[PDB]
Amino acid sequence: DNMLLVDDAINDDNSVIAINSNTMDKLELFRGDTVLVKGKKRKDTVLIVLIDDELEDGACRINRVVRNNLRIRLGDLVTIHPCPDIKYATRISVLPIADTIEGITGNLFDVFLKPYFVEAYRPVRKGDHFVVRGGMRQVEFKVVDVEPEEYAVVAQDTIIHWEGEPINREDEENNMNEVGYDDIGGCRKQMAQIREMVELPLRHPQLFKAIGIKPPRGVLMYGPPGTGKTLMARAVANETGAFFFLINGPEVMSKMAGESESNLRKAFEEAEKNAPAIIFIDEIDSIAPKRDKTNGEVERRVVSQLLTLMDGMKARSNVVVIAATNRPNSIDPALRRFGRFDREVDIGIPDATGRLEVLRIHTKNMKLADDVDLEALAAETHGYVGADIASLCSEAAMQQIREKMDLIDLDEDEIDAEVLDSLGVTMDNFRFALGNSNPSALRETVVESVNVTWDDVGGLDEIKEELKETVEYPVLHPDQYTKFGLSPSKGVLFYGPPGTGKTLLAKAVATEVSANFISVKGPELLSMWYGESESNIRDIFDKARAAAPTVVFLDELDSIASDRVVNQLLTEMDGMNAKKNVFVIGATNRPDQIDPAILRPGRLDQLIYVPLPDENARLSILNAQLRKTPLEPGLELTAIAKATQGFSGADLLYIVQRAAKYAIKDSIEAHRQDPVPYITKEHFAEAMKTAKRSVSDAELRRYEAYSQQMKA
Amino acid sequence: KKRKRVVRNNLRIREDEENNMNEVGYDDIGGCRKQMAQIREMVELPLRHPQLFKAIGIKPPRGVLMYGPPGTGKTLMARAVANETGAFFFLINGPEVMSKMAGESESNLRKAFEEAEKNAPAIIFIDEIDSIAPKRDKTNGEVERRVVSQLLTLMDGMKARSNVVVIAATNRPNSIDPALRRFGRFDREVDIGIPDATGRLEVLRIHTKNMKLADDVDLEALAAETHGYVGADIASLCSEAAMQQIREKMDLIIDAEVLDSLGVTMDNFRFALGNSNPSALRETVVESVNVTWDDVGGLDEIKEELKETVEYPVLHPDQYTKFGLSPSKGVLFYGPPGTGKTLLAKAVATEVSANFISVKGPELLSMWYGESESNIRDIFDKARAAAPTVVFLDELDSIASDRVVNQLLTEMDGMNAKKNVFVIGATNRPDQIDPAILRPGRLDQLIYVPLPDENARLSILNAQLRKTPLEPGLELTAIAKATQGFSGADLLYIVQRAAKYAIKDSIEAHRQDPVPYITKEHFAEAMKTAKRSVSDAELRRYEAYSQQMKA
Numbered sequence A: 001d002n003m004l005l006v007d008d009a010i011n012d013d014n015s016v017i018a019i020n021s022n023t024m025d026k027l028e029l030f031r032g033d034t035v036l037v038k039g040k041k042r043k044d045t046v047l048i049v050l051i052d053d054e055l056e057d058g059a060c061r062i063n064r065v066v067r068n069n070l071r072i073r074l075g076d077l078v079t080i081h082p083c084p085d086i087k088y089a090t091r092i093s094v095l096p097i098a099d100t101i102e103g104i105t106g107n108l109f110d111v112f113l114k115p116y117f118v119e120a121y122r123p124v125r126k127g128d129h130f131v132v133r134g135g136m137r138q139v140e141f142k143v144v145d146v147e148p149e150e151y152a153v154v155a156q157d158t159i160i161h162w163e164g165e166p167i168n169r170e171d172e173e174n175n176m177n178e179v180g181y182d183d184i185g186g187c188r189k190q191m192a193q194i195r196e197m198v199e200l201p202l203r204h205p206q207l208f209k210a211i212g213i214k215p216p217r218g219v220l221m222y223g224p225p226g227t228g229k230t231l232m233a234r235a236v237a238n239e240t241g242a243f244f245f246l247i248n249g250p251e252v253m254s255k256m257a258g259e260s261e262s263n264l265r266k267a268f269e270e271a272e273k274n275a276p277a278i279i280f281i282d283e284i285d286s287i288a289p290k291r292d293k294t295n296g297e298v299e300r301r302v303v304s305q306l307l308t309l310m311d312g313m314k315a316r317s318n319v320v321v322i323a324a325t326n327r328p329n330s331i332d333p334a335l336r337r338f339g340r341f342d343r344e345v346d347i348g349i350p351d352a353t354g355r356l357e358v359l360r361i362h363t364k365n366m367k368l369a370d371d372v373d374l375e376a377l378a379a380e381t382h383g384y385v386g387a388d389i390a391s392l393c394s395e396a397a398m399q400q401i402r403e404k405m406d407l408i409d410l411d412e413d414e415i416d417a418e419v420l421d422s423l424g425v426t427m428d429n430f431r432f433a434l435g436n437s438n439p440s441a442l443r444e445t446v447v448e449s450v451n452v453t454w455d456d457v458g459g460l461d462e463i464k465e466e467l468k469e470t471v472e473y474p475v476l477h478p479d480q481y482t483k484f485g486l487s488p489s490k491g492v493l494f495y496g497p498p499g500t501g502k503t504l505l506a507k508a509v510a511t512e513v514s515a516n517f518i519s520v521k522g523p524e525l526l527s528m529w530y531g532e533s534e535s536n537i538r539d540i541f542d543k544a545r546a547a548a549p550t551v552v553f554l555d556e557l558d559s560i561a562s563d564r565v566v567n568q569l570l571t572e573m574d575g576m577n578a579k580k581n582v583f584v585i586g587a588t589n590r591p592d593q594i595d596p597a598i599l600r601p602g603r604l605d606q607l608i609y610v611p612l613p614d615e616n617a618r619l620s621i622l623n624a625q626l627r628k629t630p631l632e633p634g635l636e637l638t639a640i641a642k643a644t645q646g647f648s649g650a651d652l653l654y655i656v657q658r659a660a661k662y663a664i665k666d667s668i669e670a671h672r673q674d675p676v677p678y679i680t681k682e683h684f685a686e687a688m689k690t691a692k693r694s695v696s697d698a699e700l701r702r703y704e705a706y707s708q709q710m711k712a
Numbered sequence B: 001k002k003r004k005r006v007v008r009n010n011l012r013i014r015e016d017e018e019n020n021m022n023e024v025g026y027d028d029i030g031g032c033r034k035q036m037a038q039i040r041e042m043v044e045l046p047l048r049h050p051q052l053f054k055a056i057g058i059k060p061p062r063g064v065l066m067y068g069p070p071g072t073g074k075t076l077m078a079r080a081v082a083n084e085t086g087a088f089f090f091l092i093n094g095p096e097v098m099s100k101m102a103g104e105s106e107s108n109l110r111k112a113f114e115e116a117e118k119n120a121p122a123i124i125f126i127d128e129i130d131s132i133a134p135k136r137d138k139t140n141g142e143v144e145r146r147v148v149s150q151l152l153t154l155m156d157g158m159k160a161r162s163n164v165v166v167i168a169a170t171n172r173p174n175s176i177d178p179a180l181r182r183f184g185r186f187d188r189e190v191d192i193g194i195p196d197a198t199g200r201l202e203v204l205r206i207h208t209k210n211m212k213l214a215d216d217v218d219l220e221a222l223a224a225e226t227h228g229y230v231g232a233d234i235a236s237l238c239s240e241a242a243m244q245q246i247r248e249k250m251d252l253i254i255d256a257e258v259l260d261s262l263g264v265t266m267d268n269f270r271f272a273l274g275n276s277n278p279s280a281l282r283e284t285v286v287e288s289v290n291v292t293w294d295d296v297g298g299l300d301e302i303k304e305e306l307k308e309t310v311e312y313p314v315l316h317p318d319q320y321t322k323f324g325l326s327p328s329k330g331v332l333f334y335g336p337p338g339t340g341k342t343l344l345a346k347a348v349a350t351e352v353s354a355n356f357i358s359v360k361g362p363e364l365l366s367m368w369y370g371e372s373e374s375n376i377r378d379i380f381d382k383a384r385a386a387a388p389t390v391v392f393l394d395e396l397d398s399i400a401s402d403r404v405v406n407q408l409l410t411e412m413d414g415m416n417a418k419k420n421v422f423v424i425g426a427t428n429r430p431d432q433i434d435p436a437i438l439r440p441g442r443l444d445q446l447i448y449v450p451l452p453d454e455n456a457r458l459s460i461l462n463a464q465l466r467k468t469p470l471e472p473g474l475e476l477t478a479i480a481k482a483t484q485g486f487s488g489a490d491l492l493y494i495v496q497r498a499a500k501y502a503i504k505d506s507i508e509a510h511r512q513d514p515v516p517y518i519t520k521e522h523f524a525e526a527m528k529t530a531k532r533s534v535s536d537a538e539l540r541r542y543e544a545y546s547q548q549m550k551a
C-alpha cells in the first residue's frame, strides 16, 4: 500500500509536493527530505515534501506540469519512496525551447539563474521540464544533463551551462520511442502472450533457474501486413524498460556483402554488453527467405551468419529475439527448429471490439465533430486492419479540409485562425471516406473471430445436438475421453442443397468453443493448385496450429475433384495430431466426386446431411432477416412460410431483398411527387408472385436417395 | 575418468563452467545403443589402440557417415564420443564454409585440416555435408564445383597412418555427391532413426533429472503415449510443460516460499503434448515395432507360412546355404480392405527383430509427381543401411507414367540376395498391379487375406477392449456371433461408437462416476446404429479371383 493517489493541484509550483503528516507516517518519512514518485513507463521524479494538514490522509498536491512530465493523469496510483541518497548537483546543462521563447528575444538564462535557484535546492532529474517566468512570458526548459548522477539537487554552487541550440517539443512526441500498452487495442490475447514470453525471462530470470530450465529465446510473431507487429514490439519493449535494438531486413539487405555480417555481429555484441536487452527484427523473410526460390550466395551467407550467431548465444543471458514476417512459412525452415524461433504467434484481423478500440486510440487528437457514432463505424467496417483505419481517418480529415477550403484562399501564405477553430470532422466525412477505402487483408486467408450463436441457426435441432456431442465435449471435457480412451474425431463433412445454412453452422460451431474461424473457399484451392495464389495449404494448416483452437472451413470441396491438392490435404490432415484442438469442416453440394481417400477413418469421415428448412425454420429465418427493417403492423409471415414449400434460405433472403427494393422505390416516387419508411403487404405480394425455387425436384430426389444410401 | 563429494566433482566422476557444455559422456545419450556401439567401435579402436590394426595387418577404416532425421542428436553424439575418448573435437558447418568468399572457403578447409593433423588425436566433424557437396547432377556452379573438388582432394590426400577420423552428418543419405562414398573416403555408413518406447523413456529420464517433478510422475505413460517423437521434441515438450507450470503459478504473483512450491505435474505434461507437433512422421524413418504374434486372431496357416518364409532362412541360414536355396523376399498381401495387413507385416518384422519401414500411398504419389522430400532410392538406401529391415509398400495399386514402377523394379533387382532386406506389398486392387512386378525373383508370392472368423472377431474385440472398462458379467461371444461378415475396421468402429455413447451418458449424468464402464445396452445400441461396410459383391469378386489364382 505505499502507492499514493494522484490528485489535481491548484498550485503551479514545480518542486513542491504537499502531503499530510499521516502520509509520512505510512512510510515513516521524516520532514525535510525529498521523495521519489514513480508512475508508469519508467517515469519518475523527485519532489520536496511539505506538510499541509488541510489535505486529507493519502491526498497529495502536485502541479499539472509534473504529472504531464511523468505521463500520468489525475487519480493515478504512483509509488512513493524516500530519498536516502539525496545529493546536490555539481554541473547541470540545460537548453531552452525555441517555440516557448517566441515573442521575446534575449538571454533569459541569466535572468532565471539567480531568482529561481537562490538557495532553493530544487531536486532535478534528467529530462525534467521546469517552467520559469521571464518578463511577460512563462518559458519551459528541459534538463539536458546533470552531474553527479543520477538526479541530484540544484545547489547554488552548481555550475549551469546553456551552450547549445533549442530543440523542438513535438519532435520527442513523434520519436515513437514512448508508446505503452495504452496505444494498442484489440490484441489482448496476443499482447498477454508476448508479455508472458518476454517479461518473465527478463524481469524474473530466477524462476527458470529455480525450476531448472533454459528460458526460451526465439519468439516469432507473424500476421497480415500493417497489423501492428512493429508497434506491439516497441510497446512491449518500452513497457519492459530494458535496452532495445532494432534491425531492419531492408536496411541490412541493402548494404554490400561483409558489411551486413559486421553490422549483425556489432548489434549482437552490443546487445550482449547491455543486458537485459531485446533484439527486434523486421521482414525477416527478406533476409532469410525460402531457399527453394532464392539460390543467390549473398542471402545464403547472411542466413548462415544469422544461424551461427543465434546458436552461439551464451546459455545464460537476458536477451530475447523477436522476428516479424507476413508469411509464416516464407522464412527459411532452418530457423524454426528447436533452439531457435519456436514460440510462434499469429495476429489476426481485429474484431468489432478491436476496431472500436483502435478507432478510439487514433481519434484522440482530431477535432471530432459533435455528432460521431464510432460504434456504427466499428460495426460497418469489417476486414480493416489498424493501418487501414488510420488511413480512413486521414481520408475523412482530408474530405473535411476539402469542404472547408472554400472559405479560405490558398494563394496567401497565412490562414486565419478563425477558420482553423471551425475545423471539425462530421459523420458524413467518415461515411464518404469509408466509401473511398480499400481493405486488402480479407483477400487472403486470415484468422478472424466470429460471434454467431445457435439462435441465428434456423432449426435443425437434431443436427445441432449431434454437432455439440461431436465437437464441444472433446473441447471442454477431454478428461472423459482420456478416461474412456476414445480419441476425438475431427473430420466432419456437410452435404446437401446449396444455400441451406452451412457456413452459418460452421461459424456457430467456431463461436461455441471460442475458436478462431478460418475460411478457405474453393477458388482459393484452385488458385493454389495453379500456383497463382501466394499462400499454400501448408501455410493454412500451420496458421491453424499456431492459432489453436481453430475451425477451418473448406467450401465447394468438390471443385478440386486435380489430385495434387487432394494429396497435399490428405498428408497435412493425417499429419495433424488428434489431441490438438483443430477441426476441419468441409462442404459440398455433390458428395460423389470427392475422392474416396478423403472419406477414410481419421479424416473427413463424419457425413451430415443438410435438409431444406421446414415451415418453422422458414418463419424463424424470415424473422432473423427482419430485425432492423420496420414492418407493416399486423403483417403475418405464416402465409409466406406456408407458400414457400421447398424454398432455401438464400431464396427467402432474396425475397426479402426484392420486397425492400420495391418499398424503397415506392418511397422514392412518393417523396419526389418519408411518410412510408417501411414495407407493406403489396410488396410481399409482388415478391411472392416473383417467387421460384433454386433447386429442381429431381435434385431433391437425388439428394434424398443419396442420403438414404449413406444411411444404409 | 575423462583424464581427470568435492573431489568427485573436481574429477568429474561462474558461468564459464555450466556454459561449457562438454564432458557429455555416454550417460547423456539414450535410445541409440546400436549406433552408439558402432561409433564407439569405429572411433575408440583406431585411436586408443592402433597397434591392433598393425598386428592384424590392415588399415583401419576412417570415413564414417551418419544420417538421420534432423534434431536426432547427431552432433551431440559426435561430441559425446569425442569427449569420452578424451581427444580434441572440431566442428564445421556446411553453410558456414559455403558462406565465406570463393577462395576463403578453401582456405578455411585446408587450414582446419592441417591444424587438426598437426595435433591429431581428434575427430573432424562436418555438418550438413550435403550443402557443401550436394548432388552433382543438380548443382554444378563455379563455387559448387570448386569447394567440392577441394574437399575431395583433401579427403583423398589424407596422410593415413594418423589418428584422424572424419564424421559427416546429413538428414538424407542420397543427398550428397556420390563421389564421397567410394573407397578411401566416407564409407562406413550409419543410420539413426526415431527411438522406440524405451529410448524415449531414457531420453525423458535424462532430461527430467533437474526439474522439480511433482509427487506423481508416470514417465512410462508419457513414453507409451508419445510416438514418433525425436529427442529434440522431447526436450521441447519438457520445456513447454515447465512453462505451463510457471504460467499456472504466476496467477498468485519474489518470495522464496512460492519458489519452493514449484512442481511439474502430469497436467503440465498433458498440456505440453496438446501444444506439441512432431516433425518426423512426414518423412520416411526407421523404427522398431513389437506386434506380438498372439495379438492377432486366426490366420494360423498364414502365420506358419510367413514363419517358414522369413524366420527359418534368417534363423538357420546355414541350412539354406547347405541346400543352396536363397531366402524368399517377394511377398504380396492382397484382400479386402481393413483386414490388418499392416498389423501382420509389423508382427512379421517383430519376429526377426528388424527395423520396420513404412511407405504409404501419398508418399508414392508425391514421388511420382516429382514433388517429394525423398524418392524410392532414399527409402531403399536406408533399408540397406539399417539392415535387417522389413520395408512395407502400402497401396501398390495407387500408382496407376510407370517411372516409379520402373525405379522400384530396378532397385529390387539390384539388391544382393544375401542382404537381409525384405519387401512386403499391400493392395486391395490386385488386378491393377503391374504384371511385371509378379515375375520370379521379385514380388512373386501371393498371400490372400480372408475376413476374420467368429473366434477371430471375439479375439479382436477382447484385445481392443483390454484398455477400456467394461460392465462385469458382459458376454462378448454373442456380439462376435452376431457380427458375421464384418471386418476388423467395422468392429473397431462399433467399439468406438459404444465408447462415445458411454461418454455422452456419463457427461449427461454429471451435468444432472455413475457408469465408468460400458454396459450391454450400449453395445446393442451401437450395433443397431452400425452395419457392414463391405458388400457381398466384393466378397464374391475376391472368391472368384482366389479360385482363378488357384486354377
Ligand SMILES: Nc1ncnc2c1ncn2[C@@H]1O[C@H](COP(=O)(O)OP(=O)(O)OP(=O)(O)O)[C@@H](O)[C@H]1O
Pocket: A183, A184, A185, A186, A224, A225, A226, A227, A228, A229, A230, A231, A282, A283, A324, A358, A361, A385, A386, A387, A390
Ligand atoms: N492497435 C493497432 N494495431 C495495428 N496498427 C495500429 C494499431 N494502433 C495504431 N496502428 C497503426 O498501425 C501502424 C503500426 O503498425 P505497422 O505498420 O508498424 O505494422 P506492420 O505491418 O507489422 O509493420 P512492419 O513495417 O514492421 O512490417 C501505424 O500506422 C500505427 O499508427
Ligand SMILES: Nc1ncnc2c1ncn2[C@@H]1O[C@H](COP(=O)(O)OP(=O)(O)OP(=O)(O)O)[C@@H](O)[C@H]1O
Pocket: A339, B028, B029, B030, B031, B032, B069, B070, B071, B072, B073, B074, B075, B076, B077, B127, B169, B203, B206, B230, B231, B232, B235
Ligand atoms: N539421445 C538423444 N537423442 C536425441 N536428442 C537428444 C539425446 N540426448 C539429448 N538430446 C537433445 O536433443 C537435441 C540433440 O542435439 P541437437 O539439438 O544438436 O540436435 P542434432 O540432431 O544433433 O542437430 P543437427 O543435426 O541439426 O546438427 C538436443 O536438444 C539434445 O539436448
Ligand SMILES: Nc1ncnc2c1ncn2[C@@H]1O[C@H](COP(=O)(O)OP(=O)(O)O)[C@@H](O)[C@H]1O
Pocket: A456, A457, A458, A459, A460, A497, A498, A499, A500, A501, A502, A503, A504, A613, A617, A621, A648, A649, A650, A653
Ligand atoms: N438454418 C438455416 N438454414 C438455412 N439458411 C439459414 C439458416 N439460418 C440462417 N440462414 C440464412 O441462410 C442464408 C445463406 O447462408 P449461407 O451461409 O450463404 O448458405 P450456404 O452455406 O448454404 O451457401 C444466410 O442469409 C443466412 O442468414
Ligand SMILES: Nc1ncnc2c1ncn2[C@@H]1O[C@H](COP(=O)(O)OP(=O)(O)O)[C@@H](O)[C@H]1O
Pocket: B295, B296, B297, B298, B336, B337, B338, B339, B340, B341, B342, B343, B452, B456, B460, B464, B487, B488, B489, B492
Ligand atoms: N487379426 C486382425 N485382422 C484384421 N484386423 C485386425 C486384426 N487385429 C487388429 N485389427 C485391426 O485392423 C486395423 C487395421 O486396419 P487397416 O489399416 O485398414 O488394415 P490394412 O491397412 O492392413 O488393410 C487396426 O486398427 C486393428 O485394430
